[PDB]
Amino acid sequence: GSMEQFELFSIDKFKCNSEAKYYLNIIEGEWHPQDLNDSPLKFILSTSDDSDYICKYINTEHKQLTLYNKNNSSIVIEIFIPNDNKILLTIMNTEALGTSPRMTFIKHK
């Protein structure tokens, strides 16, 4: 549909359990250096003037975190932040659909 145009996300910093180094080093900032109309994927941790994502829990599967947005209804997103240019995005809803798009984008290209 549409989504790749100014993707600004913010965690509540609810505590979480794992994710830190590779998380901050790779997700905590923006994917692609402006390689789509200066509108990439930029996420921050805590504060952010008014945060909206609730840090659910960590997945020891492929070093990833699953979070839900309280500014909609029940939006659970599962994303993996490794390194060596790689990330995956998934969207689901606890009271609706999901498990359809999945965007696997690398840190350059």
Side-chain angles (χ1 to χ4, degrees), residues 1-108:
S2 184
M3 206 64 261
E4 258 264 86
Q5 192 182 76
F6 227 89
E7 291 187 58
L8 193 132
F9 299 102
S10 315
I11 212 161
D12 227 90
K13 205 264 149 60
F14 198 40
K15 214 141 66 69
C16 305
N17 295 122
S18 79
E19 287 77 31
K21 277 65 176 289
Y22 70 136
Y23 200 79
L24 66 90
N25 199 56
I26 289 113
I27 193 187
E28 176 268 312
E30 56 192 319
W31 293 82
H32 268 156
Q34 299 148 329
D35 250 35
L36 178 119
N37 231 205
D38 63 89
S39 63
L41 182 88
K42 198 158 85 76
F43 163 96
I44 197 71
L45 278 87
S46 74
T47 310
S48 195
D49 200 42
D50 190 35
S51 56
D52 287 298
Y53 271 142
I54 317 162
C55 192
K56 240 295 169 59
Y57 75 106
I58 77 93
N59 282 145
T60 334
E61 183 205 45
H62 240 271
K63 278 280 145 56
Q64 51 161 29
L65 203 152
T66 314
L67 49 289
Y68 62 129
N69 202 161
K70 212 197 88 294
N71 201 359
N72 204 275
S73 209
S74 232
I75 311 301
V76 83
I77 285 173
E78 197 163 292
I79 50 177
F80 181 29
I81 303 91
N83 204 159
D84 191 44
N85 326 131
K86 215 93 171 185
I87 186 162
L88 47 133
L89 174 281
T90 312
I91 191 162
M92 294 221 295
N93 187 328
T94 326
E95 266 67 42
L97 244 80
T99 184
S100 164
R102 287 209 301 241
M103 199 140 289
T104 334
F105 47 119
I106 64 159
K107 230 295 288 292
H108 306 144

